[PDB]
Amino acid sequence: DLKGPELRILIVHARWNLQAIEPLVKGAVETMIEKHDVKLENIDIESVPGSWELPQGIRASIARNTYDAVIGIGVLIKGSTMHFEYISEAVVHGLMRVGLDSGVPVILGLLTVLNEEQALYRAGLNGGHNHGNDWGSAAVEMGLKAL
C-alpha cells in the first residue's frame, strides 16, 4: 500500500468526449487521495482541446513547475477517415518522448477505441471498471520510485 503524502501530481486531460473524460479524471483523483494519501491541493488539473495537444501541454507544464508524476488523459474514437490512426500513433510516441526527455514519469491514460460504448465501459459506466483508478495508483508508484 504505497502512500505519497508529499507527491505533487499533474493531470492534463483533453476535452473531446467529455462524457468519458470526467469519470476517468475523478477515478484517478479519488484513488490517489482516498487510497494513497495524496493531498488534493497537491494535484494540479489542466486541460487542452484535444489529444493531439496532450504532449505539448504536458511539456509546457513540467517546464514551469515541478511534478513527481504526470497523467495524460484523452479519448480517441475511430471515425470515418484515417485521422484516428495517425493522431493515435503520433500522440503515443509524443507522450513517451516527453517522459523520456524530462525524466518525469508520464502515465498513459489514453483510450483508443472503435466506438463510444467502449470508452464509457472503460470509464466505469455500464458495468465496466474505471481505468482512471489504475492510472492514479501507477502515478503514485512511479512518482515514489523517482524519489
Add this chain to the structure above:
Amino acid sequence: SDLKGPELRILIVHARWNLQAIEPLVKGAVETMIEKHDVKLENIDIESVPGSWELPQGIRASIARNTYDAVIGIGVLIKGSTMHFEYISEAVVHGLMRVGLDSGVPVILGLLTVLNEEQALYRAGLNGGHNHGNDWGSAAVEMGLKALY
C-alpha cells in the same frame, strides 16, 4: 472556447494540394480567431508550401525567423492507388509533433487524411458538413494563451 487573444501572433502554414478543400479550412480558422477570439488580422501570418510533406519544414523555418504564440499546419492528403498516402501521412504527423516539441511552440493539427475528395470537402464545411478550420482556430488561441501567459 471563451478565450480572447488580442495580442497573440498566430502563424498558419498550408499546403496547396487539393486547394478546393484548403481554402475553406484556412478561412474558417482565420474568421473564427478574429470574430470569436479578437485576434487581429495583422497578427496572423499566412504562408504556403507545395505539399503536406513540406509543412513540417516550412513551419520549422518560419518559427526560427519570427516569433509566434501558436501555429496551425493545414494540409489535405487523399488516399491514391499506391502506398504513397500512408507513408507521407505517417511521416508528416510525426514531423509536426516533433517540430512542436523541439521548439516549445504549440502546433495545431489541421491535417486531413481521407479516403476520397468528398470526405475532405465535407470536413471543410461543404455539402452540409462542419468546417473543422473553426475548431483549429479556437485551439490555436487556447494553446497560444496557455503558453504566453
Add this chain to the structure above:
Amino acid sequence: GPNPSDLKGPELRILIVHARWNLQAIEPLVKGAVETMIEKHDVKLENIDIESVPGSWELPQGIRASIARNTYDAVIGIGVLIKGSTMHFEYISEAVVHGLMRVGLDSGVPVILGLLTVLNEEQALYRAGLNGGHNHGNDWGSAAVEMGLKAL
C-alpha cells in the same frame, strides 16, 4: 531458432525491470532469466537487481531512471501485452518497443527485449515455459550476459 553462448560473466551487474500485468506469465520469465544467468553463466545472485513497474508502458521510464542511478552492464526489460478489444494493444506495443530501443541507444547500455506481444493468454504462458513450451526468459538471460561482456 536462437544460438546462445557459453560465456561466463562473474563480474557482470545485471538489472531486470518487469511489469506486473499478467503475473502468471511474468514470474516464470523472470525466474528463467535469473536461473540461467546464475547456473549457466556464473553471474552472482547479489549482482542481479530486480525492479518492477505497473505496466509495460512504464518499462522504458523505469529502466531510464535506474541506469541513471546505478551502473549496469546490461538490462532486461520484461512485460506481457495481450491483444484486447480496442487498439490500445497496438499503440502501446509500438511505443514501448521504440522506447526501449531509444533508452538503449541513448545510454549505451544493452537493453534486452523481454517483451511478449501476444493475441491471447495461452500464447504468453506457452512462451513462459508452461504447457510444454520453451521458457524464453532463459534466452534473455544468455543475451544479457553476452551483450554485457561485449560492452567491456
Add this chain to the structure above:
Amino acid sequence: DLKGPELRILIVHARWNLQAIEPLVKGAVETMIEKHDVKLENIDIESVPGSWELPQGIRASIARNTYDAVIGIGVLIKGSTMHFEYISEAVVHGLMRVGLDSGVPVILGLLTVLNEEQALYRAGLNGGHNHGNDWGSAAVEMGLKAL
C-alpha cells in the same frame, strides 16, 4: 512564376529500378532549368545503391557543401516479403529527419508502389504525368523561401 538563378540544388537518387528513375531525374532537372532559370552548373547529381542509402547520402553531402534544397529520388516496389513496408517507413522518416536536423528542405521524390507499371506511369511513361517536374518546382520554391 518563381525563378532561382542563384539556387544550388542537390539531387540524390537510388539506382534500383533505373527505368523509372532516369525519367524522374530528367523531369526534375529540365523543369528547374527551363521553367525556373536554375543554372545547369548549380545542380549536383549524386547516386546511391538503394533507397535505404538515400538519407545517409543526403546527410553526408549537405555536410560537405551548401545547398538551398535537396531532392531525394528512389523507387520502391512491393515484393513478396515485408521488406518493402519496413524500408519504406524507415526511409521516409529518415528523409524527414535529415531535413529537420539540417534546416535544409528535403523534397520527397520517393515512389512506393505495388508494381512496376505504377512507377513508370508516375515517371511520365504510358500516358502518365512525370512527377519529377513537380519535385523540381517544389525544390525551387522551398529553396527560395529559406531566405
Add this chain to the structure above:
Amino acid sequence: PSDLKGPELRILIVHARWNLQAIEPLVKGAVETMIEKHDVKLENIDIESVPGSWELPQGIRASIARNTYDAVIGIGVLIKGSTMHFEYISEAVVHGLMRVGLDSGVPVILGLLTVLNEEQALYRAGLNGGHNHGNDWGSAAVEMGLKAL
C-alpha cells in the same frame, strides 16, 4: 559507377545468430564479393555477432564507438511467428539501424530480411535457385564507404 575498388577500406559486419542456416550464406556472399570483386582485404573486415536482430543496432553502435570503419553491414533474419512479435521487432530494428547511421555519420547497410517463412529467407540467401543478397550488400558497403572519403 564503373568498377569500385576499396583496398584501404575497413568494413564492419555485425550479424545476429537466429536462423544461422540463412545467416551464414549471407555473410559469406558479402565477404566474398568485397574481396574478389572490390579488392577489399580480408584482414580489414571485422565480423561480430549478437544473439538476435534486436541487438544489431546496439552492437553496431558499441563497435563504431571503439574502432573506425568506413562502412557497416547489419545482417539478421526475422521470420513471422504466431504473435505480433515479428512486426514490432522489425519496425524497431529498422528505425534503430537508420538512427545509428545518421547519428554517427557512418554508412550502415541494411542486410536485414523480414520474411513470412523460412523458405523465403533461404531463397534470398542464394539457396534453392535464389540470388544471394549478401553480394549486393557487399558492393553497397564498398560504394558507400568510398563516397564517405
